[PDB]
Design a protein around this ligand. Structure first.
Ligand SMILES: CC(C)Oc1cccc(CN2CCC3(CC2)C(NC2CCCCC2)=NC(=O)N3c2cccc(F)c2)c1
Length: 369
């Protein structure tokens, strides 16, 4: 294919995120950068930290321009503080261009960097609406599209580690079957609408507004499938019932306890498949994505294979994280305001699937206002 040099440009450690090499400044300083479709800032470690193997040294970059404004980005699990500036940026195993982009030089952080993750910064691929300090700080992808002829689309194949980030197009070697698209509801996070949920083909039977309360997003930076409290409770009750051939402690379903099996004896067949139906591109038409227990039971790094249940509770809406994305080739078609899913080219009884079309009425009522 024409995008062959972008294939296998991602690396990662299981549950620690997927990262791409990015070259900043002059002379070049290459760093490993987390690919994050759930945020909109490009930021790099720019001072020593015990979890960083390398960091950005602004004084060595002749093309660095200080914006003379600080920036702070806070989350429930971690945060960072830094200084704004601009510098030349290229992605050596990405598009053949160099752009001048905003870059936040992280000088201090709290529980942000991960010990042994091998990444030193973050590439926020979402929209300006959620950029810090505000929506006037142009995100990296926006700069790329404004400054070059690279088409306004990227696609991710996260292999549950390595993967591919294809910038400016779609690589047909990365998927099988058809690509099915769901609208991007609003350009802030990559917001989508979930219209039905099934556990082993059995409808969870919740009002669909609950699945998207207060939003549903596609986020390569989040490990789990995160569900709103009411949905999480019903989903666990159904998964437990479907996996009744084996009993697990209550804490396992809450991610407080792990369960380990003798190497290669994991009874995948006892756990159910989970299907999320997404709003399609035509009136009353939907499609579904189906994930296996190999996606939602995450290995924790012996003669025993330990797993963590990777479906968890959220109070800020549904988050379709790496648990969801790992089964699929995901196209972030910004130009057409849509997200595409297809079966990823990366057991003997079941496979992840993308199927359609289905008829689903009143899907417009599923969204939060
Ligand atoms: C691979 C993950 C586990 O590790 C990291 C580490 C850093 C950044 C990210 C990307 N990324 C950063 C933001 C994220 C998810 C993961 C988050 N997103 C929510 C924002 C509001 C809407 C709903 C989604 N809430 C958190 O506390 N996060 C977090 C999670 C872990 C650490 C952290 F500091 C923040 C991920």
């Amino acid at each position: 294919g024409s995008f062959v040099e972008m294939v296998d440009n991602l690396r990662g450690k299981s549950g620690q995120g997927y990262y791409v090499e990015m070259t900043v400044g002059s002379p070049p300083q290459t760093l490993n950068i987390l690919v994050d479709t759930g945020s909109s800032n490009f930021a790099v470690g720019a001072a020593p930290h015990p979890f960083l193997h390398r960091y950005y040294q602004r004084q060595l970059s002749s093309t660095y321009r200080d914006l003379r404004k600080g920036v702070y980005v806070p989350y429930t699990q971690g945060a960072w503080a830094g200084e704004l500036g601009t510098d030349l940026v290229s992605i050596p195993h990405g598009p053949n261009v160099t752009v001048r982009a905003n870059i936040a030089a992280i000088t201090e952080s709290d529980k942000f960097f991960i010990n042994g993750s091998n990444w030193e910064g973050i590439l926020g691929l979402a929209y300006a609406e959620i950029a810090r300090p505000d929506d006037s700080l142009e995100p990296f992808f926006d700069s790329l599209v404004k400054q070059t002829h690279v088409p306004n689309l990227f696609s991710l194949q996260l292999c549950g580690v390595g993967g591919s980030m294809i910038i400016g197009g779609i690589d047909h070697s990365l998927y099988t079957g058809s690509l099915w698209y769901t609208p991007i509801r609003r350009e802030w996070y990559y917001e989508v609408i979930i219209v039905r949920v099934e556990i082993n083909g059995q409808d969870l039977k919740m009002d669909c507004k609950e699945y998207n309360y207060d939003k549903s997003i596609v986020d390569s930076g989040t490990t789990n499938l995160r569900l709103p409290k009411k949905v999480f409770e019903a989903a666990v009750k159904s998964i437990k019932a479907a996996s009744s051939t084996e009993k697990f402690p209550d804490g396992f379903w809450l991610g407080e306890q792990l369960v380990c099996w003798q190497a290669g004896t994991t009874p995948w067949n006892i756990f159910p498949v989970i299907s999320l139906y997404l709003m399609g591109e035509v009136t009353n038409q939907s499609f579904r994505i189906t994930i296996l227990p190999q996606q939602y039971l995450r290995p924790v790094e012996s003669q025993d294979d330990c797993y963590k249940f990777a479906i968890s509770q959220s109070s800020t809406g549904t988050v379709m994280g790496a648990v969801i994305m790992e089964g699929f080739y995901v196209v972030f078609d910004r130009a057409r305001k849509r997200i595409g899913f297809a079966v990823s080219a990366c057991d003997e009884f079941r496979t992840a699937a993308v199927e359609g079309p289905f008829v689903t009425l009143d899907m417009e009522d599923c969204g939060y206002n």
